[PDB]
Amino acid sequence: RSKADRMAKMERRERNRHAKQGESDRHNAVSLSKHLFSGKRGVGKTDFR
Amino acid sequence: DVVTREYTINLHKRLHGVSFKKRAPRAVKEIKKFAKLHMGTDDVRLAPELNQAIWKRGVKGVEYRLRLRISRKRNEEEDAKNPLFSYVEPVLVASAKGLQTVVVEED
Amino acid sequence: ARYGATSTNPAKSASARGSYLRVSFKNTRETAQAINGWELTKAQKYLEQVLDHQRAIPFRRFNSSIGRTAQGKEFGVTKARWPAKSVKFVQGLLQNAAANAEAKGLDATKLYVSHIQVNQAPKQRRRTYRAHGRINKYESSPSHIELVVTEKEEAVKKVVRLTSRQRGRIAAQKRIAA
Amino acid sequence: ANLRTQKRLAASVVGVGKRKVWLDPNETSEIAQANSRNAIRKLVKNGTIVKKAVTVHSKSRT
RNA sequence: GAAAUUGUUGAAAGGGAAGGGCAUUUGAUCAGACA
RNA sequence: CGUGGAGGUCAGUGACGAAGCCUAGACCGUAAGGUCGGGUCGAACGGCCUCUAGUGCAGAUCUUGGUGGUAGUAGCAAAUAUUCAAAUGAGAACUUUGAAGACUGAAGUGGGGAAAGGUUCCACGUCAACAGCAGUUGGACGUGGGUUAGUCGAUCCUAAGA
RNA sequence: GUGAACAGCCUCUAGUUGAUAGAAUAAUGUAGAUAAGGGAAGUCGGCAAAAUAGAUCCGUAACUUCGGGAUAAGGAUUGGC
């Protein structure tokens, strides 16, 4: 069991460095979001406040 | 050196121009500093009966003069302070004026 | 094993490490260079006084826009600060290295910190939220600590060529001078 | 110890809200052993948990 | 287990940038060679 | 001159250390580059005569991944507010109990429900991560327990409509 | 409870005490105020702020599709026992 319980701690490390709050946090970061960078904003109605 | 004394304390000159939501929490931090002055200790204990006496008129109606009793006592082993600590408890009196400091005798 | 480059005797030297310690790195660089090279018994009481706002840690490198205080006149720097959470780990390692020296059987009074070294660990990756739905990082900088204590040691013929003309000059003056 | 259970649980037995029930600090070991409603009836009536009767709202000036 | 980047030790320089070219001093350092 | 593979050749070098990497140590070529020593490492790789091509990068607001300066800085300031002792603990501004002080003030910070979520509900254990401070606590993590219908609903009927 | 009232303010039953904190009170801020004499001279412009306000009684113009205009304007008064 202590052989098996230490293998839970060995396999947990990679998710802790990425600050995953579980073994079930698989929220994926989009590399480049479309609304941030694709636009040209001139006189008129604009894309935000 | 166990010595129990009486004291008056002028809280009006210590709470001059203090924000109304921070008067009664500040008057508590004065007595821990005020018992540090006379007895020369850091760990100062306030009785729950004294906490009622400060806070009785809300946060913003702390009394002008209080009449305290500061008792210095021996402290227990494996405490990291030093073997002495104070203990501040209130004595209930008619008027806080007209009183000066008095050594309470021991028995 | 595999510390930094050390020039000392490994016979009379204990050591201690700390891996993946979740402190700030910029605070633990400075509270390691304040202590580097002191006597061991003087270093521990100093760190006991840093907690009580009696003596401050000087910040030399990571020190932009730090407020001033008067307690850095001892070291000659206006900028100083009292990083408390960094001291509570670093003096925890001095208690270890003092305990490691008693197992080897070294003196307590002669011992001094000779090497202390702190460098960056793998960073946390935590995220926070900003205006316009933008996602920027919000991360830590943990650090590895290692230190080595050492006893103090109470201590601190080249053949020369010359020409035949210069060989005569010494021989002539030795003949003349009484 | 942690006593959020028995504070909540004695409120259900006596039938009064959580702001009213009184758990004395001297019996901090005796109350923590009780983990059922059936023990709470015994702990109430021998005088460890009491009621704290109603705050006055007088109507004399009215 | 390379580079960016960082720590510690050691050497060196520093009056509003640094780095480069030609020549030599200074300190450190290094192979060749007479039998 | 250099790189990846091919046909030859040196009966080429190699676990007594092959490639790779580091090296203000040495030599050669005007140069692309070639050779040697030292440190690391552990298993295959060269010279020459030719053959072949997914063959050489500093730039393309280049592509994927990684790291800095700025910087321990901007900041963590709406919703009136917290205080003292005791227990628990290696540890308490933040957990639990008691004593105080206030607030929401019946178009509520209260008591239930429809969409919607799917075990969050409760107990026992327990803190590496998350809770932008902290943590002994949690809507976290680990293991289990828990929704009972002749009458409450669906099921039946029809509306605009399919 | 006050009041025309489910307004605003305070309280009882019920619930919460959560929103990073400690010390000092420089400038400039954001939010909220008061100001001698004069009263829009300020300014694109009375922007903003001040003034008036609930209630009973007296009183109400030009005009008008005769219904309105109208709370027009303006003027006296308000506690306690």
Curated annotation (Swiss-Prot), chain A:
Subcellular location: Nucleus, Nucleolus
Disulfide bonds: none
Listed Basic and acidic residues bias regions: 1-28
Location of the region described as Disordered in the Swiss-Prot/TrEMBL record: 1-49
Remaining remarks: Present with 28000 molecules/cell in log phase SD medium.
Chain's role: Involved in the biogenesis of the 60S ribosomal subunit.
Subunit structure: Associated with nucleolar and cytoplasmic pre-60S particles. Directly interacts with RLP24.
Family indicated by similarity: Belongs to the TRAFAC class OBG-HflX-like GTPase superfamily. OBG GTPase family. NOG subfamily.
Name of this protein: Nucleolar GTP-binding protein 1
Species in which this protein is naturally found: Saccharomyces cerevisiae (strain ATCC 204508 / S288c) (Baker's yeast)
Gene: NOG1
Swiss-Prot record, chain B:
One of the Pfam families matching this protein, by short name: Ribosomal_L31e
Function text: Component of the ribosome, a large ribonucleoprotein complex responsible for the synthesis of proteins in the cell. The small ribosomal subunit (SSU) binds messenger RNAs (mRNAs) and translates the encoded message by selecting cognate aminoacyl-transfer RNA (tRNA) molecules. The large subunit (LSU) contains the ribosomal catalytic site termed the peptidyl transferase center (PTC), which catalyzes the formation of peptide bonds, thereby polymerizing the amino acids delivered by tRNAs into a polypeptide chain.
Note: There are 2 genes for eL31 in yeast.
Gene Ontology CC terms: cytosol; cytosolic large ribosomal subunit
Annotated localization: Cytoplasm
GO biological process entries: cytoplasmic translation; regulation of translational fidelity
Keyword Ribosomal protein tagged: yes
Similarity comment: family membership: Belongs to the eukaryotic ribosomal protein eL31 family.
InterPro entries according to UniProt: Ribosomal_eL31, Ribosomal_eL31_CS, Ribosomal_eL31_dom_sf
Protein name, UniProt field: Large ribosomal subunit protein eL31A
SMART domains: Ribosomal_L31e
Subunit structure: Component of the large ribosomal subunit (LSU). Mature yeast ribosomes consist of a small (40S) and a large (60S) subunit. The 40S small subunit contains 1 molecule of ribosomal RNA (18S rRNA) and 33 different proteins (encoded by 57 genes). The large 60S subunit contains 3 rRNA molecules (25S, 5.8S and 5S rRNA) and 46 different proteins (encoded by 81 genes).
Key words, A-Z: Cytoplasm, Ribonucleoprotein, Ribosomal protein
Curated annotation (Swiss-Prot), chain C:
Protein name, as recorded: Large ribosomal subunit protein uL22A
Cross-link (Glycyl lysine isopeptide (Lys-Gly) (interchain with G-Cter in ubiquitin)): K45
GO biological process, one term: cleavage in ITS2 between 5.8S rRNA and LSU-rRNA of tricistronic rRNA transcript (SSU-rRNA, 5.8S rRNA, LSU-rRNA)
Quaternary organization: Component of the large ribosomal subunit (LSU). Mature yeast ribosomes consist of a small (40S) and a large (60S) subunit. The 40S small subunit contains 1 molecule of ribosomal RNA (18S rRNA) and 33 different proteins (encoded by 57 genes). The large 60S subunit contains 3 rRNA molecules (25S, 5.8S and 5S rRNA) and 46 different proteins (encoded by 81 genes). uL22 is associated with the polypeptide exit tunnel.
UniProt record similarity statement: Belongs to the universal ribosomal protein uL22 family.
Location in or out of the cell: Cytoplasm
KW Phosphoprotein (keyword) present: yes
Cellular component terms (Gene Ontology): cytoplasm; cytosol; cytosolic large ribosomal subunit; preribosome, large subunit precursor
Other comments on record: There are 2 genes for uL22 in yeast.
Keywords linked to the UniProt accession: Cytoplasm, Isopeptide bond, Phosphoprotein, Ribonucleoprotein, Ribosomal protein, Ubl conjugation
Modified residues (Phosphothreonine): T69
Source organism (scientific name): Saccharomyces cerevisiae (strain ATCC 204508 / S288c)
UniProtKB/Swiss-Prot annotation, chain D:
Locations listed in the record: Cytoplasm
Subunit field text: Component of the large ribosomal subunit (LSU). Mature yeast ribosomes consist of a small (40S) and a large (60S) subunit. The 40S small subunit contains 1 molecule of ribosomal RNA (18S rRNA) and 33 different proteins (encoded by 57 genes). The large 60S subunit contains 3 rRNA molecules (25S, 5.8S and 5S rRNA) and 46 different proteins (encoded by 81 genes). eL19 lies in close proximity to the binding site for eukaryotic initiation factor eIF4G.
Taxonomy, superkingdom: Eukaryota
UniProt gene name: RPL19A
Cross-link annotation Glycyl lysine isopeptide (Lys-Gly) (interchain with G-Cter in ubiquitin), location: K20, K52, K59
Positions of post-translational Phosphoserine modification: S29, S36
Family: Belongs to the eukaryotic ribosomal protein eL19 family.
Function: Component of the ribosome, a large ribonucleoprotein complex responsible for the synthesis of proteins in the cell. The small ribosomal subunit (SSU) binds messenger RNAs (mRNAs) and translates the encoded message by selecting cognate aminoacyl-transfer RNA (tRNA) molecules. The large subunit (LSU) contains the ribosomal catalytic site termed the peptidyl transferase center (PTC), which catalyzes the formation of peptide bonds, thereby polymerizing the amino acids delivered by tRNAs into a polypeptide chain.
Further comment found in the protein's record: Present with 97700 molecules/cell in log phase SD medium.
Protein name per the record: Large ribosomal subunit protein eL19A
